[PDB]
Amino acid sequence: AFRPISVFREANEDESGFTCCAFSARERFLMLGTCTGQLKLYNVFSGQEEASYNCHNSAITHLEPSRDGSLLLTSATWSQPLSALWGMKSVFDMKHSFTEDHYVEFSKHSQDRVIGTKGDIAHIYDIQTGNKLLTLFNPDLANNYKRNCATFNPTDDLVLNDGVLWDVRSAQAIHKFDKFNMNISGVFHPNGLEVIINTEIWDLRTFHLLHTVPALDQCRVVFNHTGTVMYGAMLQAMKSPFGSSFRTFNATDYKPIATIDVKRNIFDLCTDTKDCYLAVIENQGSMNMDTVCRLYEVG
């Protein structure tokens, strides 16, 4: 079950502008991006704001804190630069920026690199220097996915970009997964064995199709930390990225668990490092922007 535990809005604002969320390394603190480009730290139980920082001059679309707690990636919708890396030690400061990338993630095993996406192109950057190490794009294998996001695999040896599997070491495309949809480019299963590209589950070894999961169509997905549950929400074709529902799946067999209809448009969802909690950003109005963060205890 998901027990509603708490709800809160952007403190002292006429209209609440939370757009995205991620749990900090610190257990009871949630980081939230806003529609005006600020990063906020909230106590997720009290709903009280602790800290605010100015990151971009447009809405934050994505946040990702590093596991050690020292770094943060942000992306914005219509700012220059579009994405940035922030230090969060003593002073909150911009380390580096990724001017043309509308989406960024850290490498997974060792978080020493950033991977940014621009359209169907992946850029890989060194965290220390900020230098672009690699541009990944192959005109012969491109799928031209409209909502492409590039990502590392769990051991950082591989990248999936626009439905193409890359060997990072050699910077060579090693396989193109055939295209079944217009938008979604796919992610790696944390088990390191499978690639989830929209409704298709591919075996990484053989490149054979393992399953078709229709309910995943047009979904962004996130896994809990233990890799046992997958959350998916369907993209809509300052508007909300998602519709009013998200779905859970058993990550070990891809069997559905629950379909949760929150009856309001969803902006984001994240889970805490202990997989005890789910945070969901939902609009109380309809595109009126007045979002709340709802916190559920995961049963």
Ligand SMILES: N#CC[C@H](NC(=O)c1c[nH]c(/C=C/C(=O)N2CCCCC2)c1-c1ccc(Cl)cc1F)c1ccc(F)c(Cl)c1
């Ligand atoms: N990280 C993470 C968690 C992940 N969030 C998103 O994917 C997400 C969360 N938010 C935006 C986008 C806002 C956006 O563009 N906005 C909203 C603010 C005003 C401007 C437009 C995106 C998003 C959408 C398209 C693309 Cl291809 C990639 C994106 F990251 C998620 C995973 C499973 C889920 F069940 C849910 Cl509800 C969210």
